[PDB]
Ligand binder design. Structure first.
Ligand code: HEM
Ligand code: HEM
Ligand code: NAG
Ligand code: NAG
Ligand code: NAG
Ligand code: NAG
Ligand code: NAG
Ligand code: NAG
Lengths: 552, 552
């Protein structure tokens, strides 16, 4: 009933109800005035003209490999480039944070409550006429239906980018320190109050936990030597609570530091690689500092490891996932002379668009056998029986599924995408078009425009009817992959702003933290400065197995 | 034993131990190089030359009243000035946060743990030779002694600035939302996790508390009408826990929202003025928005009230306390085109230097009687017996004590200043000279230089011996008042940076929040934009009693 229901306020302006039937727009600092923040300010026009389309840039970025190579070799130039991408990307996200599940308005409660996931777009008034506002029907397409018609995988489609198993699992582990829904509270609630890259998944959510995980000696994390290799310690010994099916014989209930990481040997693989990497930096710091004590060694390592993580996530993981030609660089300084908030709050939207279940294949082939989900899930023995070398080897070579494009959701993880559809529903999310407009993208004129193909398009049109009523999660998967890539524009445009904030806006990236001393010396500083997914494995895996986020 | 013990690293560089006996300095971005970050970078020299002394500026600021008057009338100019003060002040504080009670090094634990108070200077190694580092003796001057010789008040010295009772109590109330030590944990620990101007003291620390305080109707806070006036509701009714002596008859156990505010009618006076100011804004918003609901009315008011509080604290409280001639202005935009972190963490140092007990007189004279501490403390009846009009009138006229200068600590609140001395001791604080250097101030060459007089000076010298061993708290009080002012340079230079951060670096000050809509319209926006201590009382006190933070 609320006049704002129809999302009248265009151009990022703010709608406020002003008397039951009438509403008002806060066109403040938008660059547009008038009833709906519709008419641009003259200078706005100037910018609007020059604005190259993301795809144009995308082309230009993905092409000219040689021109690009010159750039990658003129430091002054590269950094110069790195900066641009770094800034532009950020004017898009809200910092400090604004809305959420419950607050369509700004409120202190919203701003202060760290248990919520922030929201990039306000939810929809519970008193509106239709779930997407005013457009659509008393209801939305049946979930189970949308799930089956355009989502579920028939024949495994591989990723045309080469993303292997080392990658898909890395992204699972990585995002799983910040995406940690508090189901007991509801979706929209995170249990990772850190709201960012805090390596909580390695260390424990709380100091109480972290302490049950630490050896308190040379700063080392606790661990055990099975066979001749190092593995996380027993839940039995450390007493840390972990999630494990009753049939697990204990004795294999690995501790780690993120309760759920015991349900997929792909998590635990990495969770043992980083455990291994902790002690490693310890022994390095401890050499360099004969005079340091346990707690300092520890505290400094957790910092370097975060340094590495951000290093690897920008220069390998994102670099790959982008398919850019221009080498992205992790250099905290490009921002040192820019306005930039070193704070971050994970948005449910980011949590949502990151439901990349399509990466999963149908069997997990660890050099010699192929296992089903039913054989992989909650089964350490596999990892203990295969070792990490012949696990890194096997995953380096094993393409993963395309995410965007169409029907590639594993019927196993089907229960999941169904839920994903249902939750965003309950979290009163908004139109996919709205989000497109929000991230300065032009809205799809037809389901057919969204898909690029026509079977699904018309198949969707069957249920959604108006494109301006098509949801966000589905269309993210049921969408037209840009060239031979894994995602479509929408997924690339909503996620990149979200990703470079929680990555760049981290305390260790702030001027007061960015310097040798913070990390234990010039040594530990370069540890961060030379991190790579190849080195992570090299130093920690049995025989410097070659690796990459690409199935060669 | 730690080589860093002697605080070798000058110019804001960072000392790091490098092998038991050797240490190393992180002169990064200091503008100085060499073993102790001692030798300046050429350009550093240039700036160093032009650097006018704080006192020069102080002079220039406090004089030329007519020149200043022209400025206060050329908008473009004033704002221009307001900006400079605004920025310079800030390059001094650490954001994001660094050290604390337990962490002399940066650590994630430090950065993440919101229960700690941040520290502007690291504590001193527990393994150093002397409590101030290496200078001094196995011990420090006896507290009890320092307390008596240069601190305690003999004859009440009034403030040469005019600070009345309205002011002293305002500052108690105000700072008491952010200064809230968790004694159960220890000094250094805050229970105010909000770390800033969150009006928690009006609303309650937790949502569970805020809920016991709210009427849930037109957004209004719960209250009661005694006589013909409005007063906070009973602890009996709301059930909110508050701190009250067993002899209190209940029936007067006012609720309010900050457990301790029930032990001084000066707190509760204001605590009732703001309660009254809440409902007021509600009724305004509820007029303007016939269509709003309880929770929205509520949430918007708490925002406007924070807007008012920041407005009043900058343009009245700070403006007065400064004695400037130039009118300070609260305009969030002066920063809109500056690098500025909209985050904040209260430092124990700020908590310490704010122990302004000297403001207190010896009797509280509420128009007709004079009460002793023993009669004022935990006694509402006074407030209820006198009313707020003849409480505002009585306080507007009743000078408060000078803080800096010498021996003006009430023998009642003596237990306190002793503690203050003992705690900064346990929190392993640093030399007053160190802090002076930290805030770009030249260190005192003699106890004599610190005091400006000679009885105390020589009296201090008796115990401290080296000026480079004199503590922070004492010397803050035992110090030379700049002209006819209440504080000395040290107190003005350490606090102002600390104050404008937590004031300006507030979400409602950030571009996304700074606009009409955030506050319910253009009405609620001007409520913030026209706030004044005169209006706070006018609108909420029985007969628009004239007020000010000055005993006329
Ligand atoms: C290896 C097998 C995997 C299984 C069986 C699995 C299963 C699930 C399940 C049960 C949920 C909860 C969904 C809900 O109830 O809303 C979930 C969430 C999620 N999964 Fe997976 N997943 C797997 C792999 C991955 C991978 C490789 C990624 C990497 C992008 C991924 C990313 C996510 C994300 C982002 C969430 C949301 C996390 C949260 O908010 O708690 N998953 N997955
Ligand atoms: C009106 C009578 C007042 C009384 C009886 C009083 C009493 C006290 C007491 C008992 C403490 C606890 C000290 C300790 O155990 O460490 C204290 C702390 C403090 N007082 Fe007052 N005070 C009064 C007024 C003021 C005023 C006007 C100010 C204004 C600056 C002030 C500022 C402080 C501060 C900053 C603290 C530390 C707060 C904390 O960390 O918990 N006090 N005062
Ligand atoms: C604003 O949008 C409303 C529909 O919500 C429309 O009726 C009105 O004419 C629009 N006005 C302008 C100036 O865009
Ligand atoms: C956050 O807000 C919800 C209600 O608004 C509350 O139930 C939850 O406990 C809050 N969390 C905290 C830490 O206050
Ligand atoms: C788990 O792996 C072990 C060894 O690789 C195997 O014996 C077991 O059958 C697997 N579990 C399932 C459910 O396949
Ligand atoms: C730095 O301080 C050390 C004492 O810790 C002193 O020996 C050395 O000469 C100093 N050097 C400079 C350049 O200040
Ligand atoms: C804060 O940190 C200290 C140790 O670093 C810990 O003992 C205390 O319990 C922590 N508080 C919280 C709320 O984590
Ligand atoms: C409290 O105030 C009343 C009236 O102002 C006074 O009669 C009474 O003695 C006071 N109580 C104490 C303990 O001083």
């Amino acid at each position: 009933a609320n006049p704002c229901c129809s999302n009248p306020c265009q151009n990022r302006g703010e709608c406020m109800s002003t008397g039951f039937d009438q509403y008002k727009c806060d066109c403040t600092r938008t660059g547009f005035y008038g009833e709906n923040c519709t008419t641009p300010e003259f200078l706005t026009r100037i910018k609007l003209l020059l604005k190259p389309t993301p795809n144009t840039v995308h082309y230009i970025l993905t092409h000219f490999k040689g021109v690009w190579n010159i750039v990658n070799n003129i430091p002054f130039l590269r950094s110069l480039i790195m900066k641009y991408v770094l800034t532009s990307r950020s004017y898009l996200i809200d910092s400090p944070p604004t809305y959420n599940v419950h607050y369509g308005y700004k409120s202190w409660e919203a701003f202060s409550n760290l248990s919520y996931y922030t929201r990039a777009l306000p939810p929809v008034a519970d008193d509106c006429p239709t779930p997407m506002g005013v457009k659509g029907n008393k209801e939305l397409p049946d979930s189970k239906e949308v799930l089956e018609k355009v989502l579920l995988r028939r024949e495994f489609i591989p990723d045309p980018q080469g993303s292997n198993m080392m990658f898909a699992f890395f992204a699972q582990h990585f995002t799983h320190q910040f995406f940690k829904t508090d189901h007991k509270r509801g979706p929209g609630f995170t249990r990772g109050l850190g709201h960012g890259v805090d390596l909580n998944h390695i260390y424990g959510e709380t100091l109480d936990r972290q302490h049950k995980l630490r050896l308190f000696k040379d700063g080392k994390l606790k661990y055990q030597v099975i066979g001749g290799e190092v593995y996380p310690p027993t839940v039995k010994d450390t007493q840390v609570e972990m999630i494990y099916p009753p049939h697990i014989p204990e004795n294999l209930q690995f501790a780690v530091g993120q309760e759920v990481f015991g349900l997929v040997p792909g998590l635990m693989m990495y969770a043992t690689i980083w455990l291994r990497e902790h002690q490693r930096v310890c022994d390095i710091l401890k050499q360099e500092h004969p005079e340091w004590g346990d707690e300092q060694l520890f505290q400094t390592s957790k910092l370097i490891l975060i340094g590495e993580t951000i290093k690897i996530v920008i220069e390998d993981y994102v670099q790959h996932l982008s398919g850019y030609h221009f080498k992205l660089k992790f250099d905290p300084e490009l921002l040192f002379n820019q306005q930039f908030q070193y704070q971050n709050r994970i948005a449910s939207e980011f949590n949502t668009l990151y439901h990349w279940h399509p990466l999963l294949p149908d069997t997990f082939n660890i050099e010699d056998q192929e296992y089903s989900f039913k054989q992989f899930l909650y089964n350490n023995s596999i990892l203990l029986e295969h070792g990490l070398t012949q696990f890194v080897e096997s995953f380096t070579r094993q393409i993963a599924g395309r995410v965007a494009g169409g029907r590639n959701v594993p019927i196993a993880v089907q229960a999941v995408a169904k839920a994903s559809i249902d939750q965003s529903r309950e979290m009163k999310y908004q139109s996919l078009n709205e989000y497109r407009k929000r991230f300065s993208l032009k809205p799809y004129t037809s389901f057919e425009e969204l898909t690029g193909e026509k079977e699904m398009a018309a198949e969707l049109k069957a249920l959604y009817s108006d494109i301006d009523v098509m949801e966000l999660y589905p269309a993210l998967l049921v969408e037209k992959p840009r060239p031979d890539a894994i995602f479509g524009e929408t997924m690339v445009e909503l996620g990149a702003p979200f990703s470079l904030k929680g990555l760049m806006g981290n305390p260790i990236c702030s001027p007061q933290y960015w310097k040798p001393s913070t990390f234990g010396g010039e040594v530990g500083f370069k540890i961060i400065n030379t991190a790579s997914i190849q080195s992570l494995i090299c130093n920690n895996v049995k025989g410097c197995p070659f690796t990459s986020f690409n199935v060669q």
